[PDB]
Paper text:
The APOBEC3 family of single-stranded DNA (ssDNA) cytosine deaminases plays important roles in innate immunity against viruses and transposons. However, a subset of APOBEC3 proteins, most notably the nuclear-localized APOBEC3B (A3B) enzyme, is strongly implicated in causing mutations in various human cancers. Human A3B consists of tandem zinc-coordinating cytosine deaminase domains: an N-terminal domain with a pseudo active site and a C-terminal functional catalytic domain. The active site has a catalytically essential zinc ion coordinated by two cysteines (Cys284 and Cys289) and a histidine (His253), with the fourth position of tetrahedral coordination available for directly interacting with the transition state of the hydrolytic cytosine deamination reaction.
The crystals have two protein monomers in the asymmetric unit, each containing a zinc ion bound in the active site. Loops 1 and 7 of A3B(187–378)QM_Δloop3 in the new crystal form show different conformations from those observed previously. In both A and B chains of the new structures, the loop 1 residue Arg211 is flipped out and, instead, the adjacent residue Arg212 projects into the DNA-binding groove and interacts with loop 7 Tyr315. In contrast, Tyr315 in chain B shows an alternative conformation differing by a rotation about the Cα-Cβ bond, in which the Tyr315 side chain is flipped away from loop 1 (χ1 ≈ 180°, trans). Importantly, this trans conformation of Tyr315 was also observed in the open state crystal structure of the A3Bctd active site bound to a TC-containing ssDNA substrate, where the Tyr315 side chain lines a hydrophobic pocket that accommodates the –1 T base. However, in our new apo A3Bctd crystal form, Tyr315 in this alternative conformation maintains the cation-π stacking interaction with the guanidinium group of Arg212. Accordingly, Arg212 in B chain is positioned differently from that in A chain, but is still blocking the ssDNA-binding groove. Of note, the two datasets we collected using different cryo-protectants showed a slight difference in the conformation of Tyr315 in the B chain. In the new crystal form, Arg210 is released and flipped out, replaced by Arg311 that in turn occupies the pocket between α1 and Trp281. The three distinct conformations of the loops 1 and 7 observed in the apo (DNA-free) A3B(187–378)QM_Δloop3 structures collectively represent possible modes of regulated ssDNA access to the A3B active site, in which the closed state of either loop 1 or 7 (or both together) is incompatible with substrate binding.
Numbering used by the authors: 190 to 223, 232 to 241, 250 to 378
The structure:
């Protein structure tokens, strides 16, 4: 399994919501039977990482008889205005053996309809939450070519996480 460069992780999962950023997304995934698959995806040539994960589901050769928990540690919450939330809704509505957890570093405020994405994902059975120190360090330890270096928090990690978490819980009340 391949690991991402540390600077790519840090640049993409920094959770300060008031920074101007390129609209790139990184999505670290793990899939476990409730038989594991792990990896990471970014947007490529206009196709969002969420859809690329859906693209690769068949290649994972999951047993249609079993239940699987899929976890996404995603740098941006999935969009509405470019169809991600709806495709994820479709996927989950049919593939009822998949339970999806979405832990987002940041809310995708670049999408005017981001709240509709969050609400739609919830209504389809996905568990959506905001990444905390725990998740950032887990992703550093699990998906990053860190060469034994411990995780070091960026300025404001905990504050941003708590503010975004309050936003998200307010939206999904
Ligand atoms: Zn999208």
């Amino acid at each position: 399994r391949y690991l991402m460069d540390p600077d790519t992780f840090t640049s993409n999962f920094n959770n300060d919501p008031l920074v101007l950023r390129r609209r790139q997304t990184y999505l670290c995934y793990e899939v476990e039977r409730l038989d594991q698959h792990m990896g990471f995806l970014c947007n490529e040539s206009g196709r969002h990482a969420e859809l690329r994960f859906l693209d690769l589901v068949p290649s994972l050769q999951l047993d249609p008889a079993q239940i699987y928990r899929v976890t996404w540690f995603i740098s941006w919450s999935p969009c509405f205005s470019w169809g991600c939330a709806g495709e994820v809704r479709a996927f989950l509505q049919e593939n009822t053996h998949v339970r999806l957890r979405i832990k987002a570093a940041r809310i995708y405020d670049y999408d005017p309809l981001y709240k509709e994405a969050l609400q739609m994902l919830r209504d389809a059975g996905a568990q959506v939450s905001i990444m905390t120190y725990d998740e950032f360090e887990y992703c550093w330890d699990t998906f990053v070519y860190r060469q034994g270096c411990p995780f070091q928090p960026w300025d404001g990690l905990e504050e941003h996480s708590q503010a975004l978490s309050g936003r998200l819980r307010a939206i999904l009340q």
